[PDB]
Amino acid sequence: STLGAAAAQSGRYFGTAIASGKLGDSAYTTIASREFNMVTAENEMKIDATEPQRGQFNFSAGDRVYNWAVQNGKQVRGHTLAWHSQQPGWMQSLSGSTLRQAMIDHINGVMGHYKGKIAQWDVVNEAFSDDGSGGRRDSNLQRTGNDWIEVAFRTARAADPAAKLCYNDYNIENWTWAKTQGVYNMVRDFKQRGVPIDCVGFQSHLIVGQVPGDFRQNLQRFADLGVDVRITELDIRMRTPSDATKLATQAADYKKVVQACMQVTRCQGVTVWGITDKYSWVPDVFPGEGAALVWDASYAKKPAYAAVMEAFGSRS
Description:
By secondary structure, the chain is α/β, with parallel strands linked by helices. It has a single domain (1-316), classed as Alpha-Beta Barrel (TIM Barrel). It has 12 helices and 10 strands. It has helices at 3-8, 26-35, 47-50, 60-71, 89-93, 96-114, 148-159, 178-193, 215-223, 244-262, 282-285, 303-313; strands at 13-18, 38-41, 75-83, 120-125, 164-169, 199-202, 205-207, 228-239, 267-272, 289-290. Strand 4, helix 7 and strand 5 (164-169) form a beta-alpha-beta unit. It is globular. This is Beta-xylanase. Belongs to the glycosyl hydrolase 10 (cellulase F) family.
């Protein structure tokens, strides 16, 4: 009778991003423990949250989410080890070999701490540009060398040989996009040379009524590379206010995305980025847009809920 349980029927999972700060919200926690069987810390395990000062790791917030998740019979997705965004001030200032080393020490430290606790990590996040060239994003990390990604994955594997290592990114859900091609070729290259990479995370921060038509095919192509694929931060935004028609379309979009995963044997699961629309990051990064999740601001199930349930238990 829950989404996680429905997903479980086919050996898949349905997860969400958990914000420790909201673990006090009874309505929030109620849905959190019942509906999902997979958890991603929304912010608690990022670079700035885990290593505030170089060499000075603080896993308080992260462990808060991990314990809660475990206490509630849920697995946890590690997010994230290397990223240009949300870096602590000390790291932002670093560059060159020092940054490279700081990146490496960070991976070891964080993974050393969760070794045996968290089995999958979004090692590198959003390394490709959105400029339309399909090339790497020009970040302080990228400037340390084009090989920083590979190094991050090799480091992660060495730190914990049992963790599934994922590359995570957005705007790579459509095969015709430059960005998607850029990511595909990297992964393909990684698989050819033996670089440690087990999965590709498709953030899937989509637009209502504009879900890539080849979403399933694209997922399959990546899976054919020999890596698992996962929808890691699903939310389908619309221009607010929401209305019956937009909500219905959203329901259909949600079913398409989940159904696409159901048709790709290597698609391990779907994680929606949040529980209720009232705590969604969407309105902040995309002004005028929102109502992207399965529960509205009043914690009421949206039409998408039944669509997701339907997508997991049947095929059109």
